[PDB]
Amino acid sequence: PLEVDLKESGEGQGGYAKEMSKEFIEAEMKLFAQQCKEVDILISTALIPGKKAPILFNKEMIESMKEGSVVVDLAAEAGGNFETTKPGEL
Amino acid sequence: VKPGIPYKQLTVGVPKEIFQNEKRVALSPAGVQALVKQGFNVVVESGAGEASKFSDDHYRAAGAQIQGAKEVLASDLVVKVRAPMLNPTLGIHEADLLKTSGTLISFIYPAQNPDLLNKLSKRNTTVLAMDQVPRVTIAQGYDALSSMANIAGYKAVVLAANHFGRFFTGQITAAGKVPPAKILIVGGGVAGLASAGAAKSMGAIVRGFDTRAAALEQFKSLGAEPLEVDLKESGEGQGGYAKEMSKEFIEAEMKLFAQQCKEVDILISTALIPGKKAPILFNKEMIESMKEGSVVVDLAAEAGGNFETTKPGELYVHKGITHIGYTDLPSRMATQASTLYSNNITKLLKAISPDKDNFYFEVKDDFDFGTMGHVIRGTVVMKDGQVIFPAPTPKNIPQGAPVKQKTVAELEAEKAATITPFRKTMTSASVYTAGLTGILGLGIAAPNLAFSQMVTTFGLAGIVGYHTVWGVTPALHSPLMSVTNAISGLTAVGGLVLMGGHLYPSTTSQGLAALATFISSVNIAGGFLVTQRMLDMFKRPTDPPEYNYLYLLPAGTFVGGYLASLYSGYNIEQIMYLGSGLCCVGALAGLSTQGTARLGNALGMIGVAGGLAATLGGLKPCPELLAQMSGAMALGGTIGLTIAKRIQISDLPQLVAAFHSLVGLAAVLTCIAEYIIEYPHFATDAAANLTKIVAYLGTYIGGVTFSGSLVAYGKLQGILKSAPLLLPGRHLLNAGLLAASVGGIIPFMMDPSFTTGITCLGSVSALSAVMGVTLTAAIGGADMPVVITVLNSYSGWALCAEGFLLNNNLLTIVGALIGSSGAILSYIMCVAMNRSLANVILGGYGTTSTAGGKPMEISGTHTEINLDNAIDMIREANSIIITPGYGLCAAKAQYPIADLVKMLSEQGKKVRFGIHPVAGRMPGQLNVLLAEAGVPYDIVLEMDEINHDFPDTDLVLVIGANDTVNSAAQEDPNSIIAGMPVLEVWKSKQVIVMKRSLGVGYAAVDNPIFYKPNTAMLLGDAKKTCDALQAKVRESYQ
Ligand SMILES: CCCCCCCCCCCCCCCCCC(=O)OC[C@H](COP(=O)([O-])OCC[N+](C)(C)C)OC(=O)CCCCCCCCCCCCCCCCC
Ligand SMILES: CCCCCCCCCCCCCCCCCC(=O)OC[C@H](COP(=O)([O-])OCC[N+](C)(C)C)OC(=O)CCCCCCCCCCCCCCCCC
Ligand SMILES: NC(=O)c1ccc[n+]([C@@H]2O[C@H](COP(=O)([O-])OP(=O)(O)OC[C@H]3O[C@@H](n4cnc5c(N)ncnc54)[C@H](OP(=O)(O)O)[C@@H]3O)[C@@H](O)[C@H]2O)c1
Ligand SMILES: NC(=O)c1ccc[n+]([C@@H]2O[C@H](COP(=O)([O-])OP(=O)(O)OC[C@H]3O[C@@H](n4cnc5c(N)ncnc54)[C@H](O)[C@@H]3O)[C@@H](O)[C@H]2O)c1
Ligand SMILES: CCCCCCCCCCCC
Ligand SMILES: CCCCCCCCCCCC
């Protein structure tokens, strides 16, 4: 289990999540840009009820990976967790 | 001159492949860092590793030089992944682009390509073949076909799924039972076992099959279901391979596969025989009977196929059951294939010329099997154009001859199975009838009722002492030793009741009693201070604050409860003896948890104080004689307190050897004294013979204990030489001394004179002292801790001889409690090695499991490293087990080891200690020295508790131990330590052994784990190297 250095309650009304603050999203993207240079596969399943999926990876954050990585996006219907995802193809 | 051309003038080359849809490359950049470390110059074609996903920047940063396409094949070494062929881009064949005296490293397949060998022979080159390396033991680090078979098996599994439209695992959720998938694997070689592992770990169940008898055991070890066929004929294929089976075996195997084919879901076939096609094992009607949507993978599609329906390279659906039939399967995992093939080529070129700045690889045909000339001649298929492909046979055949020696437990099995069930019951009934007739013999010889009551409390206290000292923790065996030495200072009880007169002694018996009280108070005070000092070093700094002064509350009302009754007209001494005996039992019983260990010192203090108070108040001494008693106990206690405080803990065995002599001497000084004070009463007594038997035996036991412990102290301290001084005739001398000592009780009876009795007492004391010096000086300085414990039992039983004599219950309870402790510690120590007490004391060669002579020889050479590779290999690990010995503590190396373990546990590692039961100069010494260093007791484990954690361990540091880690105890029945339980450190990943020089230990002339490939030597003194490791971990991480 990873961790960020901001203590914000992620829950909303029930078991579902809610929208995060801009500073929390920036700190989470700092964590993901830190550990995006070490992993080989990454699977993003982030999906917030009520609106579209949060963008969590820049187009320059994902090009810093190794030559040959696989990036799977399970939120391609309701937006996506990447600003580089054609929503139906490889 | 060295007959090779140097590394600087040569150049390897990595071309790209013009073969269709080819993706893997010949060398990864990890194989370009190597061979530049070795000395070659590397040139790489521009577009070479993009399909294998290796950019040109990594080849530039590895030391190579990106260059074109014509001047890469024109190199001294040419390294390909497959054979040269027609190049339609340049319009010329690649063999015409090579230089004259080049060298090619490729899959050649010379039995199938004669025109390639013709075109290479016209260019006058030397061609090595990665195909034709034979499958032997020393050439399994470079076996390209096994690597490609492993990758093909994993890729066949991961291509079975993503075309199979159900789960493999199967879960029980609250939405419906889903069953696991069922996968059948025809033929387990490398690809079959890779597929079985990849399918079993993912979740499915495997029911594979092979014709050889070993591959079914490999299937059962991987966890599959080995299938059997009814026609039971031999698995052919001499050399460890498979031939072509008979027709009836094939039509029975196809019946088995047709029965199993209706119910499995994925069928991976890997059947392949050498020099022929793959056998057709599945018909069309056999494979159309599967469930719709099944996946059928064919791994033998290059050499024929195992199916009547396989298009080699397509995925046609064929009424549901999808066929996968790719012929270039490792090319779809080209990164892993390129890395493993680069490792195979690098480990080939590191091995065929193991020399600096020369490159030779002599090709000769003398053909010693197993050696490397076999590998060199079998690999090279062309040398200077003249083809040498049919390799002649190796001369001898090792590696397949069963001559294998059994292990030592397998030789112990025929001893454990040759004892008939009649003789076990016969010797058990013999032991019990001997015990019962000995009880009857003690019954007949009883003069009075007090002897029978005292034998009853002796037997019960012996059983209590037996059960209570197996319960103690093996980490606290030396505080147990110290507690028994403190409680054995109750020979002052025997001194106070024979101590009479006034402020000074009057007669000689009253001076012997004063001497006994003096040295026993030395024992009491010294033992309780060293116990309290040793039990305060196990105290962790994160433990809760304990309040030991609250145990002044029972003591203050026990002896304070005594005197208030003593100032009342009551006599409570026979019950105060029981209470003191129970408190001394609880002193040893509480020393069994590590949370109750400080209770086990306080209860012993309460017991000794209550015993001395009872024997001091049941005499009613006059105020000048009580002053003499208190002065003797105060001076002895003062000397004991000032000795037990200045010592180091590493000098603790000597002090223990210094205590039993003061228990022995006092015992002698009691017994002779009670021969003097009760000599004029032997006329009018019926028990006049019992009190002389017991006096004689107590004098003998004390005289042995005194002199033996004195020689033990002299040989532990360094005064006497630690070599076993052997007299010319020593067994005849010892038997004559024992015969004189036993036969001297016959002049001691049958004569009521005083001069005869006192000269028999003096003679048995002198003969017992001479026997102690004679038996102790023939032992040797390493098994001297036996003499510490055996005499620890004798200093117990002398107390019983002081309790039978004075008619005192507390002395017999305490003496049984100490004798059982010493006997059980010496048993644990004799069974921790594999020697008997007659083997240690009398002197015997080796071990009671050795056999014959000629221990087996040593094989190989030792790997030796320095501080930097050792510290880098510590940093790679994530679970370390340290096995310390006496060399760690003789060099005072436990303090930087404790600081190093603390630093490595601050960084999330798992660093534990493993202790052998006879590592040290005393039972449990090494636990206390690690506790003094500062190590918490929960990461220090015994041998039995850590022994099954060695295969799942990244690193083992062996610091100053040789015999306790020696593998020849488990696999050489002729060894001097054969059968001794040892710390099996060889079963881990890596072992660093730190010692001064490659020599011996105390026995076992050479250690076979030092000459083992998973063991690196780090020579040097332990103090310097441990300080160096501490400084490097400190200065690399902080
Ligand atoms: C004070 C109120 C009245 C009570 C009077 C009762 C009669 C006298 C009984 C004395 C025996 C001890 C009582 C039970 C234990 C008490 C708790 C305790 O000691 O905790 C460890 C406590 C606390 O230990 P610690 O773990 O805090 O370590 C600190 C250690 N020192 C204090 C030395 C720096 O330590 C001590 O009390 C001192 C060290 C242990 C004793 C060392 C000398 C032993 C001498 C022989 C023992 C006595 C034999 C009998 C001879 C006659 C004695 C009068
Ligand atoms: C004034 C009163 C005086 C009273 C004196 C009372 C003396 C009581 C003596 C008690 C000790 C008895 C020892 C029996 C040992 C039996 C062990 C055994 O089973 O061995 C077979 C075993 C066979 O190996 P094993 O590994 O199969 O062990 C047996 C295990 N079971 C039973 C489960 C199968 O031999 C050994 O292990 C080798 C070593 C044996 C000896 C080890 C030391 C024994 C203790 C000696 C201490 C000193 C004695 C002092 C005597 C004093 C006399 C005055
Ligand atoms: N503990 C007991 O209660 C007890 C009882 C009876 C018998 N024993 C005996 O105890 C032995 C224990 O065996 P073991 O393997 O632990 O001991 P070992 O083989 O005698 O010694 C271990 C090795 O440590 C090395 N060493 C010694 N001093 C060193 C130092 N200052 N620095 C670095 N290395 C040092 C020595 O090798 P180099 O000098 O070659 O470098 C020595 O061979 C048993 O074999 C048994 O015979 C013990
Ligand atoms: N270090 C070592 O000991 C080591 C290393 C590498 C290889 N090897 C040996 O080399 C072989 C490795 O296997 P491989 O995959 O490389 O060879 P392979 O490609 O020839 O394997 C084909 C497999 O199919 C089996 N088979 C043949 N005919 C069959 C039939 N009619 N029905 C069912 N199964 C049939 C064979 O027994 C074999 O297991 C083994 O014999 C192994 O012991 C040993
Ligand atoms: C070994 C235990 C004692 C054996 C005693 C045998 C009989 C002695 C008789 C002595 C005269 C009554
Ligand atoms: C002749 C009478 C002998 C009485 C004593 C026999 C031996 C008893 C030994 C008891 C243990 C020390």
UniProtKB/Swiss-Prot annotation, chain B:
Chain residues that bind NAD(+): 135-137, 190, 210-212, 240, 253, 272
Alphabetically ordered keywords of this record: Acetylation, Membrane, Mitochondrion, Mitochondrion inner membrane, NAD, NADP, Transit peptide, Translocase, Transmembrane, Transmembrane helix
Keyword Thylakoid attached: no
One of the Pfam families matching this protein, by short name: PNTB_4TM
One cellular-component annotation, GO: mitochondrial inner membrane
All ranges on the Mitochondrial matrix side of the membrane: 1-427, 532-548, 833-1038
Topological type in the membrane: Multi-pass membrane protein
Residues carrying N6-succinyllysine: 70, 177, 247, 284, 1032
Localization of this protein: Mitochondrion inner membrane
GO MF annotation, one: identical protein binding
Function: The transhydrogenation between NADH and NADP is coupled to respiration and ATP hydrolysis and functions as a proton pump across the membrane. May play a role in reactive oxygen species (ROS) detoxification in the adrenal gland.
Similarity remark: In the N-terminal section; belongs to the AlaDH/PNT family.
NCBIfam families registered for this protein in UniProt: pntA, PRK09424.1
Protein name: NAD(P) transhydrogenase, mitochondrial
Native organism taxonomy: Eukaryota, Metazoa, Chordata, Craniata, Vertebrata
Gene: NNT
